[PDB]
Curated annotation (Swiss-Prot):
Originating gene: alkB
Binding locations of Fe cation: H117, D119, H173
Keyword Metal-binding included in the entry's annotation: yes
Top-rank lineage group of the source organism: Bacteria
Effect on the protein of changing W55A: Abolishes activity towards single-stranded DNA containing 1-methyladenine
EC number annotated for this UniProt entry: 1.14.11.33
Catalytic activity: a methylated nucleobase within DNA + 2-oxoglutarate + O2 = a nucleobase within DNA + formaldehyde + succinate + CO2
Name of the molecule in the record: Alpha-ketoglutarate-dependent dioxygenase AlkB
Pfam family, one: 2OG-FeII_Oxy_2
Keyword Amino-acid biosynthesis annotated: no
Domain Fe2OG dioxygenase: 99-199
Lineage: Bacteria, Pseudomonadati, Pseudomonadota, Gammaproteobacteria, Enterobacterales
A GO molecular function held by the record: broad specificity oxidative DNA demethylase activity
Co-factor binding details: Binds 1 Fe(2+) ion per subunit.
Amino acid sequence: LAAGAVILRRFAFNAAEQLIRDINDVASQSPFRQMVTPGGYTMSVAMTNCGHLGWTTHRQGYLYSPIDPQTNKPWPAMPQSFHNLCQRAATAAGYPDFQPDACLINRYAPGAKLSLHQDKDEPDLRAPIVSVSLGLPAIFQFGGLKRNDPLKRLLLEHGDVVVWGGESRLFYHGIQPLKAGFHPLTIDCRYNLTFRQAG
Ligand SMILES: [Fe+2]
């Protein structure tokens, strides 16, 4: 249970193949890189973006930038398949006016994790985040408004779409070490797209 969250399991199953082709297309211009946190530690989750803006780490913290700091080129345009799926997901959730300008693509290798954090770099925290999972299953862990609040678990599998709105939007969250295994479309990893209204 998560207030404001609309869980649409296997919603992106049909679009999955095209999404993976489009991730590889995005990755050819802006490669997956394990971003260095402000404290000097490399993240285990490999990331990249597409859209006008893109999430990245820098010296003084976290920010959205229209430029990829590794390639020094802008982030690739958001694929049509990405726009179409996010629009369908958002509309089904009660947000037909949601128009993302940023999509953070997370790649999880076996054992890759993401510790507890909040997504608060966006200007309007009332605007939801559309999460699309592809490939190997992962355990999404979440608390509440505070970091010491009781942790709940949710498995996110291939094609699972969640629209994190309302209270759920501000929840402290993370991903547990990705269990090893096989998936027909991604081989040995998990991909996660998080559409954001960043401008
Ligand atoms: Fe997050």
